[PDB]
Protein backbone atom coordinates (compact mmCIF):
# COMPACT_ATOMS: atom_id res chain seq x y z
CA UNK A 1 0.00 0.00 0.00
CA UNK A 2 3.17 2.20 -0.37
CA UNK A 3 4.47 3.54 -3.74
CA UNK A 4 6.61 1.23 -5.97
CA UNK A 5 10.30 1.23 -4.96
CA UNK A 6 12.32 2.72 -7.82
CA UNK A 7 15.10 0.52 -9.31
CA UNK A 8 18.03 2.90 -8.46
CA UNK A 9 16.79 3.29 -4.88
CA UNK A 10 16.63 -0.52 -4.37
CA UNK A 11 20.06 -0.86 -6.08
CA UNK A 12 21.77 1.63 -3.77
CA UNK A 13 20.06 0.46 -0.57
CA UNK A 14 20.73 -3.27 -1.01
CA UNK A 15 24.34 -2.95 -2.29
CA UNK A 16 26.97 -4.45 0.08
CA UNK A 17 27.22 -2.60 3.43
CA UNK A 18 27.38 -2.95 7.27
CA UNK A 19 23.80 -3.74 8.44
CA UNK A 20 22.38 -4.30 11.97
CA UNK A 21 22.12 -8.12 12.18
CA UNK A 22 20.66 -10.24 15.02
CA UNK A 23 23.50 -12.66 15.95
CA UNK A 24 23.12 -15.65 18.29
CA UNK A 25 25.62 -15.50 21.21
CA UNK A 26 26.19 -19.28 21.28
CA UNK A 27 27.15 -19.03 17.56
CA UNK A 28 29.87 -16.44 18.42
CA UNK A 29 30.99 -18.32 21.59
CA UNK A 30 30.45 -22.07 20.71
CA UNK A 31 32.70 -23.33 23.52
CA UNK A 32 30.26 -22.29 26.29
CA UNK A 33 29.04 -25.31 28.24
CA UNK A 34 28.48 -23.65 31.65
CA UNK A 35 25.87 -20.94 30.77
CA UNK A 36 22.74 -19.95 28.81
CA UNK A 37 22.30 -16.27 27.86
CA UNK A 38 19.71 -13.52 28.25
CA UNK A 39 19.10 -12.10 25.63
CA UNK A 40 20.09 -15.20 23.60
CA UNK A 41 21.16 -12.92 20.70
CA UNK A 42 22.66 -9.44 20.11
CA UNK A 43 22.33 -6.65 17.52
CA UNK A 44 25.60 -6.31 15.54
CA UNK A 45 26.83 -4.32 12.55
CA UNK A 46 27.77 -7.01 10.01
CA UNK A 47 28.33 -7.09 6.22
CA UNK A 48 25.14 -7.72 4.36
CA UNK A 49 23.66 -7.17 0.97
CA UNK A 50 24.70 -7.91 -2.56
CA UNK A 51 27.49 -7.52 -5.07
CA UNK A 52 25.80 -8.13 -8.28
CA UNK A 53 28.63 -10.23 -9.71
CA UNK A 54 29.23 -13.99 -9.46
CA UNK A 55 33.02 -13.42 -9.31
CA UNK A 56 32.52 -11.10 -6.26
CA UNK A 57 31.54 -11.53 -2.53
CA UNK A 58 30.66 -8.97 0.25
CA UNK A 59 33.43 -8.89 2.90
CA UNK A 60 34.62 -6.74 5.87
CA UNK A 61 37.62 -4.42 5.39
CA UNK A 62 37.47 -2.69 8.81
CA UNK A 63 36.46 -4.34 12.09
CA UNK A 64 36.08 -3.40 15.76
CA UNK A 65 34.69 -4.80 19.02
CA UNK A 66 31.62 -3.86 21.08
CA UNK A 67 31.04 -4.75 24.79
CA UNK A 68 27.56 -5.62 26.01
CA UNK A 69 26.08 -6.43 29.41
CA UNK A 70 24.65 -9.96 29.04
CA UNK A 71 22.84 -12.01 31.68
CA UNK A 72 25.00 -15.12 32.22
CA UNK A 73 22.74 -17.94 33.52
CA UNK A 74 23.59 -21.24 35.23
CA UNK A 75 20.20 -23.04 34.84
CA UNK A 76 18.42 -23.83 38.16
CA UNK A 77 21.41 -22.33 40.12
CA UNK A 78 21.98 -18.62 39.58
CA UNK A 79 22.45 -15.59 37.33
CA UNK A 80 24.63 -12.48 36.99
CA UNK A 81 25.22 -9.71 34.42
CA UNK A 82 28.63 -9.97 32.77
CA UNK A 83 30.43 -8.04 30.05
CA UNK A 84 30.75 -9.81 26.68
CA UNK A 85 32.74 -8.66 23.66
CA UNK A 86 31.56 -9.06 20.04
CA UNK A 87 32.95 -8.39 16.59
CA UNK A 88 31.50 -5.58 14.41
CA UNK A 89 32.09 -4.81 10.71
CA UNK A 90 32.72 -1.05 10.16
CA UNK A 91 33.46 -1.06 6.39
CA UNK A 92 32.52 -3.55 3.61
CA UNK A 93 33.75 -4.26 0.08
CA UNK A 94 32.87 -6.51 -2.84
CA UNK A 95 35.96 -8.52 -3.43
CA UNK A 96 37.01 -11.35 -5.78
CA UNK A 97 35.63 -14.67 -4.42
CA UNK A 98 37.88 -17.01 -2.37
CA UNK A 99 38.60 -19.79 -5.01
CA UNK B 1 30.95 2.49 25.73
CA UNK B 2 29.33 -0.70 27.16
CA UNK B 3 25.80 -1.46 25.87
CA UNK B 4 23.48 -1.63 28.91
CA UNK B 5 21.70 -5.00 29.51
CA UNK B 6 18.10 -3.62 29.15
CA UNK B 7 19.02 -1.83 25.90
CA UNK B 8 20.47 -5.10 24.41
CA UNK B 9 17.39 -7.01 25.70
CA UNK B 10 14.87 -4.66 24.04
CA UNK B 11 16.83 -4.29 20.78
CA UNK B 12 17.36 -8.00 20.15
CA UNK B 13 13.93 -9.26 21.30
CA UNK B 14 11.85 -10.70 18.40
CA UNK B 15 10.55 -7.94 16.03
CA UNK B 16 10.25 -6.93 12.31
CA UNK B 17 13.80 -5.95 11.20
CA UNK B 18 15.17 -4.76 7.80
CA UNK B 19 16.67 -7.96 6.31
CA UNK B 20 18.59 -8.40 3.05
CA UNK B 21 16.70 -11.15 1.17
CA UNK B 22 17.96 -12.90 -1.99
CA UNK B 23 15.39 -12.67 -4.82
CA UNK B 24 16.14 -16.16 -6.17
CA UNK B 25 15.39 -17.50 -2.64
CA UNK B 26 11.89 -15.89 -2.75
CA UNK B 27 11.28 -16.86 -6.41
CA UNK B 28 13.13 -20.25 -6.85
CA UNK B 29 11.26 -21.01 -10.12
CA UNK B 30 13.00 -18.12 -12.06
CA UNK B 31 16.09 -20.33 -12.68
CA UNK B 32 16.87 -18.92 -16.19
CA UNK B 33 16.75 -15.24 -15.01
CA UNK B 34 19.24 -13.25 -12.98
CA UNK B 35 18.22 -10.12 -11.04
CA UNK B 36 19.85 -6.71 -10.48
CA UNK B 37 20.08 -6.04 -7.54
CA UNK B 38 20.36 -9.77 -6.64
CA UNK B 39 18.72 -9.05 -3.25
CA UNK B 40 16.19 -6.65 -1.62
CA UNK B 41 15.71 -4.95 1.79
CA UNK B 42 12.61 -6.40 3.54
CA UNK B 43 10.95 -6.07 6.94
CA UNK B 44 11.12 -9.64 8.33
CA UNK B 45 10.85 -11.24 11.80
CA UNK B 46 14.18 -11.35 13.46
CA UNK B 47 15.69 -11.63 16.87
CA UNK B 48 15.22 -13.87 19.86
CA UNK B 49 12.70 -15.23 22.30
CA UNK B 50 12.64 -15.85 26.03
CA UNK B 51 13.55 -19.60 25.77
CA UNK B 52 14.11 -22.75 23.60
CA UNK B 53 10.38 -23.68 23.70
CA UNK B 54 9.54 -20.48 21.75
CA UNK B 55 10.02 -19.32 18.14
CA UNK B 56 9.75 -15.86 16.59
CA UNK B 57 6.95 -15.71 13.96
CA UNK B 58 4.88 -13.19 11.86
CA UNK B 59 1.30 -12.39 12.92
CA UNK B 60 0.63 -9.57 10.36
CA UNK B 61 1.92 -9.45 6.78
CA UNK B 62 1.79 -7.19 3.70
CA UNK B 63 3.40 -6.85 0.23
CA UNK B 64 5.91 -4.37 -1.31
CA UNK B 65 6.52 -3.84 -5.09
CA UNK B 66 9.99 -3.05 -6.38
CA UNK B 67 11.44 -2.20 -9.81
CA UNK B 68 14.02 -4.96 -10.46
CA UNK B 69 16.23 -5.40 -13.51
CA UNK B 70 15.20 -8.78 -15.01
CA UNK B 71 18.10 -10.26 -17.03
CA UNK B 72 18.11 -13.12 -19.62
CA UNK B 73 21.90 -13.81 -19.70
CA UNK B 74 23.59 -13.18 -23.09
CA UNK B 75 20.16 -12.13 -24.59
CA UNK B 76 18.52 -9.07 -23.02
CA UNK B 77 17.31 -7.06 -20.01
CA UNK B 78 14.38 -4.93 -18.81
CA UNK B 79 13.08 -3.35 -15.58
CA UNK B 80 10.04 -5.21 -14.22
CA UNK B 81 7.91 -4.95 -11.11
CA UNK B 82 8.36 -7.64 -8.45
CA UNK B 83 6.27 -8.23 -5.33
CA UNK B 84 7.69 -9.31 -1.98
CA UNK B 85 6.32 -10.28 1.41
CA UNK B 86 6.87 -8.06 4.49
CA UNK B 87 6.27 -8.91 8.17
CA UNK B 88 4.46 -6.05 10.02
CA UNK B 89 3.98 -7.69 13.46
CA UNK B 90 5.88 -10.52 15.23
CA UNK B 91 5.23 -12.81 18.20
CA UNK B 92 7.11 -15.34 20.29
CA UNK B 93 5.07 -18.53 19.97
CA UNK B 94 5.40 -22.18 21.10
CA UNK B 95 7.70 -24.11 18.71
CA UNK B 96 6.17 -26.28 15.91
Amino acid at each position, epitope marked *: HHEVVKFMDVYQRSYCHPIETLVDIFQEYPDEIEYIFKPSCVPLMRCGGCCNDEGLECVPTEESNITMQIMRIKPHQGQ*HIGEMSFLQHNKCECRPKKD | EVVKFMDVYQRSYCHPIETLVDIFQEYPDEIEYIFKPSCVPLMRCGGCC*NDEGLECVPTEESNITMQIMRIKPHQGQHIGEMSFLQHNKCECRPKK
Partner: antibody
Amino acid sequence: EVQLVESGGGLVQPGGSLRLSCAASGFTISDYWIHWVRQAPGKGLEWVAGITPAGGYTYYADSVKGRFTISADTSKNTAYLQMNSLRAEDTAVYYCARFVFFLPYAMDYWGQGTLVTVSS
Amino acid sequence: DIQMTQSPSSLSASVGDRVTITCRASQFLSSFGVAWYQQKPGKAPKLLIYGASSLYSGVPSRFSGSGSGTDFTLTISSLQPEDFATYYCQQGLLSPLTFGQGTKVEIKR
Protein backbone atom coordinates in the same frame (compact mmCIF):
# COMPACT_ATOMS: atom_id res chain seq x y z
CA GLU C 1 21.38 -14.49 53.11
CA VAL C 2 19.16 -13.05 50.35
CA GLN C 3 16.58 -10.60 51.74
CA LEU C 4 14.09 -8.06 50.42
CA VAL C 5 13.03 -5.47 53.01
CA GLU C 6 10.11 -3.15 52.35
CA SER C 7 9.30 0.25 53.93
CA GLY C 8 7.28 3.42 53.20
CA GLY C 9 3.81 2.04 53.89
CA GLY C 10 1.06 3.33 56.15
CA LEU C 11 -1.94 5.67 56.04
CA VAL C 12 -2.62 7.99 52.98
CA GLN C 13 -5.54 10.41 52.30
CA PRO C 14 -7.55 9.70 49.05
CA GLY C 15 -5.78 11.25 46.03
CA GLY C 16 -2.47 11.02 47.89
CA SER C 17 1.00 9.79 46.92
CA LEU C 18 3.24 7.17 48.57
CA ARG C 19 6.61 5.63 47.73
CA LEU C 20 7.38 2.03 48.69
CA SER C 21 11.05 1.03 49.00
CA CYS C 22 12.37 -2.45 48.40
CA ALA C 23 15.84 -2.94 49.90
CA ALA C 24 17.90 -5.87 48.68
CA SER C 25 20.78 -7.56 50.57
CA GLY C 26 22.66 -10.78 49.81
CA PHE C 27 22.45 -10.00 46.07
CA THR C 28 22.73 -7.12 43.51
CA ILE C 29 19.32 -5.72 42.50
CA SER C 30 20.69 -4.90 38.91
CA ASP C 31 21.19 -8.63 38.25
CA TYR C 32 17.34 -9.09 38.56
CA TRP C 33 13.86 -7.62 37.82
CA ILE C 34 11.90 -6.54 40.95
CA HIS C 35 8.10 -7.10 40.62
CA TRP C 36 5.30 -5.68 42.75
CA VAL C 37 2.35 -7.82 43.93
CA ARG C 38 -0.65 -6.59 46.06
CA GLN C 39 -3.26 -8.36 48.30
CA ALA C 40 -6.46 -6.39 49.15
CA PRO C 41 -7.97 -7.35 52.57
CA GLY C 42 -9.59 -10.78 52.21
CA LYS C 43 -8.82 -10.87 48.43
CA GLY C 44 -6.25 -12.90 46.38
CA LEU C 45 -2.91 -11.93 44.82
CA GLU C 46 -2.84 -9.15 42.17
CA TRP C 47 0.28 -8.59 39.97
CA VAL C 48 0.91 -4.82 39.96
CA ALA C 49 4.13 -3.89 38.14
CA GLY C 50 7.38 -5.13 36.68
CA ILE C 51 9.73 -5.40 33.66
CA THR C 52 8.24 -8.21 31.57
CA PRO C 53 10.06 -11.00 29.59
CA ALA C 54 8.09 -10.53 26.35
CA GLY C 55 9.78 -7.38 25.03
CA GLY C 56 11.64 -6.06 28.06
CA TYR C 57 9.56 -3.12 29.17
CA THR C 58 7.67 -2.13 32.36
CA TYR C 59 4.02 -3.34 32.49
CA TYR C 60 1.38 -2.27 34.99
CA ALA C 61 -2.05 -3.66 36.11
CA ASP C 62 -4.91 -1.85 34.26
CA SER C 63 -6.22 -0.32 37.56
CA VAL C 64 -2.76 1.13 38.42
CA LYS C 65 -1.58 1.87 34.82
CA GLY C 66 -1.06 5.63 34.48
CA ARG C 67 -0.76 6.47 38.24
CA PHE C 68 2.06 4.06 39.27
CA THR C 69 5.78 4.20 38.41
CA ILE C 70 8.55 1.69 39.30
CA SER C 71 12.28 2.69 39.44
CA ALA C 72 15.63 1.62 41.05
CA ASP C 73 18.66 3.21 42.75
CA THR C 74 21.61 1.01 41.82
CA SER C 75 23.97 2.61 44.47
CA LYS C 76 21.41 2.00 47.26
CA ASN C 77 20.68 -1.62 45.92
CA THR C 78 16.97 -0.67 46.18
CA ALA C 79 13.84 -0.77 43.94
CA TYR C 80 10.88 1.67 44.41
CA LEU C 81 7.12 1.79 43.65
CA GLN C 82 5.77 5.35 43.44
CA MET C 83 1.99 5.29 43.84
CA ASN C 84 0.06 8.51 43.11
CA SER C 85 -3.65 9.55 42.92
CA LEU C 86 -4.41 6.81 45.47
CA ARG C 87 -7.93 5.47 45.89
CA ALA C 88 -9.85 3.16 48.31
CA GLU C 89 -9.30 0.09 46.02
CA ASP C 90 -5.49 0.56 46.46
CA THR C 91 -5.87 -0.39 50.21
CA ALA C 92 -3.77 -3.59 50.34
CA VAL C 93 -0.63 -5.33 51.51
CA TYR C 94 2.12 -4.58 48.95
CA TYR C 95 4.93 -7.08 48.31
CA CYS C 96 8.04 -6.79 46.19
CA ALA C 97 9.37 -10.03 44.68
CA ARG C 98 12.54 -11.15 42.90
CA PHE C 99 11.55 -12.17 39.34
CA VAL C 100 14.17 -14.74 38.25
CA PHE C 101 15.50 -16.42 35.02
CA PHE C 102 17.54 -19.38 36.46
CA LEU C 103 14.13 -20.75 37.77
CA PRO C 104 12.41 -19.41 34.65
CA TYR C 105 9.85 -16.66 35.30
CA ALA C 106 9.46 -17.39 39.02
CA MET C 107 9.57 -15.11 42.10
CA ASP C 108 11.88 -16.92 44.57
CA TYR C 109 12.39 -14.23 47.28
CA TRP C 110 9.63 -11.90 48.54
CA GLY C 111 9.46 -8.87 50.81
CA GLN C 112 7.67 -9.18 54.19
CA GLY C 113 4.84 -6.98 52.86
CA THR C 114 3.59 -3.55 53.92
CA LEU C 115 0.02 -2.35 54.38
CA VAL C 116 -1.08 0.82 52.58
CA THR C 117 -4.31 2.28 53.98
CA VAL C 118 -6.14 4.78 51.74
CA SER C 119 -8.41 6.62 54.23
CA SER C 120 -9.64 10.12 55.11
CA ASP D 1 -5.28 -10.76 29.51
CA ILE D 2 -4.82 -14.51 30.15
CA GLN D 3 -7.11 -15.73 32.89
CA MET D 4 -6.09 -18.37 35.44
CA THR D 5 -9.02 -20.16 37.06
CA GLN D 6 -8.37 -22.48 39.97
CA SER D 7 -10.67 -25.35 41.05
CA PRO D 8 -12.01 -25.94 43.76
CA SER D 9 -12.18 -22.38 45.19
CA SER D 10 -11.53 -23.91 48.72
CA LEU D 11 -11.21 -27.56 49.74
CA SER D 12 -11.05 -29.71 52.98
CA ALA D 13 -9.29 -33.08 53.60
CA SER D 14 -7.62 -35.31 56.23
CA VAL D 15 -3.98 -35.69 57.27
CA GLY D 16 -2.35 -38.34 55.03
CA ASP D 17 -4.77 -37.63 52.14
CA ARG D 18 -3.80 -37.03 48.50
CA VAL D 19 -5.29 -33.70 47.31
CA THR D 20 -5.04 -32.00 43.86
CA ILE D 21 -5.63 -28.29 42.92
CA THR D 22 -6.39 -27.52 39.24
CA CYS D 23 -5.52 -24.35 37.36
CA ARG D 24 -7.20 -23.78 33.99
CA ALA D 25 -5.76 -21.21 31.50
CA SER D 26 -7.94 -19.08 29.15
CA GLN D 27 -5.48 -20.04 26.28
CA PHE D 28 -2.57 -22.46 25.56
CA LEU D 29 0.50 -21.88 27.75
CA SER D 30 3.88 -23.50 27.23
CA SER D 31 4.65 -25.43 30.46
CA PHE D 32 7.67 -23.30 31.65
CA GLY D 33 5.78 -20.08 32.28
CA VAL D 34 3.57 -21.76 35.01
CA ALA D 35 4.41 -21.36 38.77
CA TRP D 36 2.66 -22.58 42.01
CA TYR D 37 2.90 -20.56 45.32
CA GLN D 38 1.77 -21.30 48.97
CA GLN D 39 0.47 -18.45 51.18
CA LYS D 40 0.04 -18.76 55.01
CA PRO D 41 -2.37 -16.12 56.59
CA GLY D 42 -0.73 -12.67 56.91
CA LYS D 43 2.52 -13.97 55.38
CA ALA D 44 4.32 -13.44 52.08
CA PRO D 45 3.79 -16.19 49.46
CA LYS D 46 6.46 -18.93 49.11
CA LEU D 47 7.44 -20.58 45.81
CA LEU D 48 6.59 -24.31 45.55
CA ILE D 49 6.69 -25.28 41.84
CA TYR D 50 8.18 -23.49 38.81
CA GLY D 51 7.99 -24.42 35.13
CA ALA D 52 4.80 -26.47 35.86
CA SER D 53 6.70 -29.51 37.22
CA SER D 54 9.99 -28.33 38.88
CA LEU D 55 10.05 -28.57 42.67
CA TYR D 56 11.79 -25.64 44.31
CA SER D 57 14.76 -26.44 46.61
CA GLY D 58 13.79 -27.15 50.23
CA VAL D 59 10.07 -27.69 49.47
CA PRO D 60 8.76 -31.10 50.76
CA SER D 61 8.59 -34.01 48.23
CA ARG D 62 4.82 -34.41 48.83
CA PHE D 63 4.40 -31.32 46.60
CA SER D 64 4.38 -32.01 42.83
CA GLY D 65 3.09 -30.14 39.80
CA SER D 66 1.97 -31.26 36.37
CA GLY D 67 0.06 -30.40 33.20
CA SER D 68 0.33 -28.81 29.73
CA GLY D 69 -1.53 -26.44 27.41
CA THR D 70 -4.51 -25.16 29.41
CA ASP D 71 -4.66 -27.60 32.35
CA PHE D 72 -2.11 -27.48 35.18
CA THR D 73 -2.33 -29.25 38.54
CA LEU D 74 -0.65 -29.17 41.99
CA THR D 75 -0.71 -32.35 44.08
CA ILE D 76 0.04 -32.79 47.81
CA SER D 77 0.50 -36.58 48.05
CA SER D 78 0.15 -36.66 51.88
CA LEU D 79 -1.61 -33.59 53.37
CA GLN D 80 -0.08 -32.25 56.61
CA PRO D 81 -1.44 -29.80 59.28
CA GLU D 82 1.22 -27.17 58.28
CA ASP D 83 -0.19 -27.41 54.64
CA PHE D 84 -3.08 -25.14 55.78
CA ALA D 85 -2.69 -22.20 53.36
CA THR D 86 -4.08 -20.55 50.20
CA TYR D 87 -2.47 -21.88 47.00
CA TYR D 88 -2.04 -19.75 43.83
CA CYS D 89 -0.89 -20.56 40.32
CA GLN D 90 0.81 -17.90 38.24
CA GLN D 91 1.65 -17.39 34.55
CA GLY D 92 4.89 -15.40 34.12
CA LEU D 93 5.53 -15.43 30.32
CA LEU D 94 2.83 -13.41 28.56
CA SER D 95 1.99 -9.83 29.56
CA PRO D 96 0.49 -8.99 31.99
CA LEU D 97 1.75 -11.56 34.49
CA THR D 98 -1.26 -12.94 36.32
CA PHE D 99 -2.17 -15.03 39.42
CA GLY D 100 -5.06 -17.44 39.86
CA GLN D 101 -8.05 -16.75 42.17
CA GLY D 102 -6.61 -19.07 44.88
CA THR D 103 -7.57 -22.40 46.54
CA LYS D 104 -7.93 -22.46 50.36
CA VAL D 105 -6.73 -25.73 51.87
CA GLU D 106 -8.32 -26.62 55.23
CA ILE D 107 -7.43 -29.71 57.33
CA LYS D 108 -9.93 -32.29 58.72
CA ARG D 109 -9.35 -33.94 62.13
